[PDB]
Amino acid sequence: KTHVQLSLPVLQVRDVLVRGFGDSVEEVLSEARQHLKDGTCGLVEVEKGVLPQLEQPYVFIKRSDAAPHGHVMVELVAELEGIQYGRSGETLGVLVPHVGEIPVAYRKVLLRK
């Protein structure tokens, strides 16, 4: 399937144990996609002071369209030293590995895979 319905655990930035997916734009997009498939991917909602507490490169989910079955259609955009790899809509948040942190909420997304 080109799209996959996911429910992403929303994590508080200060709870996150593994603060990024790796060391290159290509690695973090690779790792993010694998964690999304394996159900081991969390979402941090971006506000003032969040991104400096996470590791670059960042992986964002961004709205790709204006929402089947409650699931917002999203795609992945990476960012390193202020350059983004991809073009998409509004940021829903930054992706991180999920290693058992307790979420505050779930974000239903339809991931372009």
UniProtKB/Swiss-Prot annotation:
Coiled coil: none annotated. Inhibits host translation by associating with the open head conformation of the 40S subunit. The C-terminus binds to and obstructs ribosomal mRNA entry tunnel. Thereby inhibits antiviral response triggered by innate immunity or interferons. The nsp1-40S ribosome complex further induces an endonucleolytic cleavage near the 5'UTR of host mRNAs, targeting them for degradation. This inhibits the integrated stress response (ISR) in the infected cell by preventing EIF2S1/eIF2-alpha phosphorylation upstream of stress granule formation and depletes host G3BP1. Residues 1-113 are annotated as: Disordered. It is found in: Host cytoplasm. The chain holds residues 11 to 125 of 7096 of the full protein. Residues 2-113 form the CoV Nsp1 globular domain. This is Host translation inhibitor nsp1. It comes from the Viruses.
